Amino acid sequence: SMIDDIYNKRILEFAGNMERIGQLAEPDAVATVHSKLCGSTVTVYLKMRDGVVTDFAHEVKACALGQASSSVMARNVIGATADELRAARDAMYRMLKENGPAPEGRFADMKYFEPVRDYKARHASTLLTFDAVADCIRQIEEKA
Numbered sequence: 001s002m003i004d005d006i007y008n009k010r011i012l013e014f015a016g017n018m019e020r021i022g023q024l025a026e027p028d029a030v031a032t033v034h035s036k037l038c039g040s041t042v043t044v045y046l047k048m049r050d051g052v053v054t055d056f057a058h059e060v061k062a063c064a065l066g067q068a069s070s071s072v073m074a075r076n077v078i079g080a081t082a083d084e085l086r087a088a089r090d091a092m093y094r095m096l097k098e099n100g101p102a103p104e105g106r107f108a109d110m111k112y113f114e115p116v117r118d119y120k121a122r123h124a125s126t127l128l129t130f131d132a133v134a135d136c137i138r139q140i141e142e143k144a
Contacts, residue, residue: 002118005115007064008112011064012064014071014112015064015067015071016067017071018070018074019071021058021059023045024045024046024055027046027047027055028136031131031133031135032132033128033131033132035128038121040062042059044057044058044135045057045136046133046136046140051082051083052080053077053078054078055078065113065125066126068112069113069126069129069130070129072110073129079106085130086134088103092113092126092130095110096127099117113126
């Protein structure tokens with residue numbers, strides 16, 4: 001089927017229930033990431049301390065896969081370490097581009113994004129939320 005494997009029931013439930021949409025009051029870093037192919041955009045607001053994410057907010061205007069991926073991030077990002085987030089982003093890259101395994105731990109819900117591997121046109125939109133968070137981490141780290 002592939003299409004029903006891509007737009008599964010979990011993917012459709014994620015995209016429809018995105019939490020923490022908006023902006024943060026006094027964020028430590030703000031990253032905006034754009035997919036030039038499809039025109040999808042994700043702006044992520046992040047607060048951190050001692051290597052741990054303490055607050056999160058984002059504004060999403062992406063396809064269903066980008067919405068579903070941003071929904072999983074908003075449910076599991078608070079309380080995660082920078083190493084946990086880079087590992088999930090690293091695992092997401094290797095799953096879609098290198099036939100790698102699905103991420104695990106607090107990002108085990110990305111297993112439902114495995115059919116997107118054979119759908120190259122949606123790879124950028126799905127990774128928008130991961131690259132926006134990693135850019136905020138890189139900003140807060142650079143401030144030293």
